[PDB]
Design a protein around this ligand. Sequence first.
Ligand SMILES: COc1ccc(/C=C2\S/C(=N\c3ccccc3C)NC2=O)cc1O
Length: 328
Amino acid sequence: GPVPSRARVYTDVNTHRPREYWDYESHVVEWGNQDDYQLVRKLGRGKYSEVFEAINITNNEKVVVKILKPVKKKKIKREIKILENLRGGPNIITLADIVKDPVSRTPALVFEHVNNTDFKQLYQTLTDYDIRFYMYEILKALDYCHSMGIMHRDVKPHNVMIDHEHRKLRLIDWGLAEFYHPGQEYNVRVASRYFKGPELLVDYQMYDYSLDMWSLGCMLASMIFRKEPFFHGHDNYDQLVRIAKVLGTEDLYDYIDKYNIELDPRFNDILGRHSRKRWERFVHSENQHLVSPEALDFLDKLLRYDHQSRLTAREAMEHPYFYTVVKD
Ligand SMILES: COc1ccc(/C=C2\S/C(=N\c3ccccc3C)NC2=O)cc1O
């Protein structure tokens, strides 16, 4: 069987919290007044919800309302509990209210509003300095939630709201987030394909906060190299092949051998043999202004097969890549 794994940091945070902190199935929702909020326009539709711009008519302020589609109540309570636990933390989206929508017959989450620019358009304008700045701001959110016993499990550009005018960033969509408990086995059907960690792609269930660090590395690679997404797989199997063409097949075998994991035999015909590549091969005249030796070293230390070898969020904040970021 597979060798077990533990987080190298924040391992016991939920063990020593009171049960109420992580026992989201028992959480009792405090409902606000649904009539306080007037929907203005639909912003998006997801797998599990629709999201709207709205006005809070008790203060005439803009808010964002996420009306959940039907899903098991445990999942709804999990997201609500995590948002309440994390509220006030650095760059964590603020849950302002929870109301019962009379049409959907489901909960509607009310969030603070971020005047965001969509990442496809924002990322073609960010400078080297902008990228370092916003990466540091994401790390603040990730170190906070990890230190609070929570893994996000869906880090991707779509879930980072940036108001570029005010240099304001919020990490959103905590609907896939979970509490970390040592030895717990988790669903591997999390994160978006391009941001899935090797642990998910080889079906290793005893993963931890370090999953978010792989996803963050995928975001970094796409921004500094100007290739979005960086690892562009056509399905979950090809996703691992795309990663192996860069990190190499020998270290993939070292990873699964360490945890006594077997690759899906489907890979026998598609994986091939690949050397590990040097990151300099992805640098060219149209992205070199975003690349530095510090950026490549930092990226190299995030994108490790072995989840136990990746930088933690706190270690990442100590990396020389962030020395040029102005600290407040
Ligand atoms: C425009 O400013 C905001 C925008 C969104 C949020 C919160 C969301 S949106 C979400 N999920 C969906 C739902 C449908 C479509 C797409 C997504 C990402 N989860 C959250 O926490 C907060 C904001 O201030």
